[PDB]
Enzyme design. Structure first.
Site, PDB file in Angstrom:
ATOM      1  N   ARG A   1      -1.733 -13.651 -17.440  1.00 28.75           N
ATOM      2  CA  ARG A   1      -0.585 -14.485 -17.786  1.00 28.75           C
ATOM      3  C   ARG A   1      -1.005 -15.932 -18.009  1.00 28.75           C
ATOM      4  O   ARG A   1      -0.693 -16.529 -19.046  1.00 28.75           O
ATOM      5  CB  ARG A   1       0.476 -14.399 -16.688  1.00 28.75           C
TER       6      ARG A   1
ATOM      7  N   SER B   1       4.734 -18.787  -4.479  1.00 28.61           N
ATOM      8  CA  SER B   1       5.710 -17.759  -4.842  1.00 28.61           C
ATOM      9  C   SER B   1       6.104 -16.911  -3.632  1.00 28.61           C
ATOM     10  O   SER B   1       6.157 -15.682  -3.696  1.00 28.61           O
ATOM     11  CB  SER B   1       5.182 -16.879  -5.978  1.00 28.61           C
TER      12      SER B   1
ATOM     13  N   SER C   1      10.049 -14.071  -9.942  1.00 23.77           N
ATOM     14  CA  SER C   1       9.830 -15.340  -9.259  1.00 23.77           C
ATOM     15  C   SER C   1      10.188 -16.549 -10.110  1.00 23.77           C
ATOM     16  O   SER C   1      10.284 -17.654  -9.567  1.00 23.77           O
ATOM     17  CB  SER C   1       8.373 -15.453  -8.809  1.00 23.77           C
TER      18      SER C   1
ATOM     19  N   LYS D   1      13.077 -18.724  -9.025  1.00 28.04           N
ATOM     20  CA  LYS D   1      12.867 -19.732  -7.988  1.00 28.04           C
ATOM     21  C   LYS D   1      13.159 -21.141  -8.495  1.00 28.04           C
ATOM     22  O   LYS D   1      13.556 -22.012  -7.720  1.00 28.04           O
ATOM     23  CB  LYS D   1      11.438 -19.665  -7.448  1.00 28.04           C
TER      24      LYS D   1
ATOM     25  N   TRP E   1       6.341 -12.051 -11.641  1.00 21.98           N
ATOM     26  CA  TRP E   1       5.828 -10.686 -11.735  1.00 21.98           C
ATOM     27  C   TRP E   1       6.831  -9.759 -11.064  1.00 21.98           C
ATOM     28  O   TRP E   1       6.917  -9.729  -9.832  1.00 21.98           O
ATOM     29  CB  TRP E   1       4.450 -10.575 -11.087  1.00 21.98           C
TER      30      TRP E   1
END
Ligand code: 4J6
Length: 241
Positions: free
Chosen positions: A227, A94, A47, A50, A187
């Site tokens: 994270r 996301s 992601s 993006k 992820w």
């Protein structure tokens, strides 16, 4: 000094995983964690792509910031994905579906050319425009992710100033103690071993920009919060926060 980087190694250790954290100030980069070799290793962007996905779409008029992508009503992997969203709303949540639609609007021809023009990772997007960042040939190292974030933060990417300023607003998270924080989580579970991302930058009160990219192995059952937790904790221990 070397004591600040000893706690960071423990942060990844206490999470029961191997990871690295790349920090860039100016034109110099520093790596922290337990698996420092990850800093120069290529992984699927997931992601985090993006960020560039939105830059290409806006620069080439493939979409607008006020455009609303209506939800079709079909069940999604996450409840936050089950709503109509602008490109900005889809960025924070996301929403893969919205940016797969945008990638199909851009097309393999423009997508591959723009990725090569910017120099994103290995710049190999294959032939499928809707999955090359999750499993496809597109791979990028955490060093290249932090370098990309630093350039976007200073609006020095090869895109118009307008488009870079719009994508910047999509990535704004919070302002903790005067520091504005921009980040894009990632992820990629469809690659073995799975990879966890957290790429962004900090705008300190005096305007100084500190880019970063957290990369760890998304182990089975590991919480997705790790994270963000390791990243925020590390920047605090590094005096950046
Ligand atoms: C990209 O990595 C992947 C998405 N992206 C993320 C991610 O790491 O943010 C996930 S995990 C899931 C998605 N929504 C939650 C976070 N956004 S929220 N809390 O809704 O605002 C966590 C997922 C694997 C691809 C499929 O887009």
């Amino acid at each position: 000094s070397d004591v600040k980087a000893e706690k960071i190694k423990n942060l990844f250790n206490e999470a029961h995983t191997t990871g690295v954290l790349v920090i860039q100030q100016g034109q110099t980069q520093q790596s922290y964690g337990n698996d420092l070799a990850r800093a120069s290793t290529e992984y699927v962007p997931a992601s985090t792509f993006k960020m560039l996905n939105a830059l290409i779409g806006l620069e080439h008029h493939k979409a607008t910031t006020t455009e609303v992508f209506k939800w079709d009503g079909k069940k999604r992997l996450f409840p936050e994905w089950e709503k109509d969203m602008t490109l900005g709303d889809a960025m924070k949540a996301s929403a893969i579906q919205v940016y797969q639609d945008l990638a199909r609007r851009i097309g393999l021809e423009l997508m591959s050319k723009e990725v090569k023009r910017v120099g994103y990772g290995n710049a190999d997007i294959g032939t499928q425009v809707d999955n090359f960042w999750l499993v496809g040939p597109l791979k990028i190292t955490p060093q290249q992710e932090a370098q990309f974030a630093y350039k976007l933060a200073n609006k020095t990417l090869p895109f118009s100033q307008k488009v870079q300023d719009e994508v910047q607003s999509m990535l704004f998270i919070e302002e903790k103690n005067g520091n504005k924080i921009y980040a894009k989580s990632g992820w990629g579970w469809d690659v073995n071993p799975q990879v966890g991302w957290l790429t962004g930058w900090v705008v300190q009160p005096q305007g100084n920009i500190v880019a970063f990219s957290l990369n760890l192995e998304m182990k089975k059952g590991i919480p997705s919060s790790v994270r963000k937790e390791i990243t925020y904790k590390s920047l605090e221990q590094l005096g950046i926060l």
